[PDB]
Design a protein around this ligand. Structure first.
Ligand code: YD8
Length: 125
């Protein structure tokens, strides 16, 4: 069964737009989105659809790139590090829920490498 998805707006949280956050949307996210292994990560895990009734019994800080995309579009983040932490949560959830060698984990590892490659150098202020 499904909990509510992570919030993509929060009127009590301050917003910010920075060159690094613009980069994270326009280049990092939008490039990862097009990768052949991106599709498991483009939306929150639907435990009912996927017949994974235990997913949210294990994963208590769920995150996906669709949520991150909407957060970036809504200037939800204060800085790039906050956004990068959401990516890191998404990858780590996949490693927690699954086990090494699983097909989904191979997909997450490949995307994580590409993600790190792209955030190695960010624009300046
Ligand atoms: C448990 C785990 O780590 C995991 C993650 C992070 N994701 C998925 C997953 N995500 C999916 C997305 C689809 N879709 C098919 C339809 N298409 C248009 C887009 C949506 C189908 C099956 C999926 N399985 C699993 C099993």
């Amino acid at each position: 069964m499904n909990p509510p998805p992570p919030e993509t707006s929060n009127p009590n949280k301050p917003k910010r737009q920075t060159n690094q956050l613009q980069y994270l949307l326009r280049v990092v996210l939008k490039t990862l989105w097009k990768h052949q292994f991106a599709w498991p990560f483009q939306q929150p895990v639907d435990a009912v659809k996927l017949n994974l009734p235990d997913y949210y019994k294990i994963i208590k800080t769920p995150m996906d790139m669709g949520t991150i995309k909407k957060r970036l579009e809504n200037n939800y983040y204060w800085n790039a590090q906050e956004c990068i932490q959401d990516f890191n949560t998404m990858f780590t959830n996949c490693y927690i829920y699954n086990k090494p060698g699983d097909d989904i984990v191979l997909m997450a590892e490949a995307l994580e490498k590409l993600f790190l490659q792209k955030i190695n150098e960010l624009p300046t202020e």
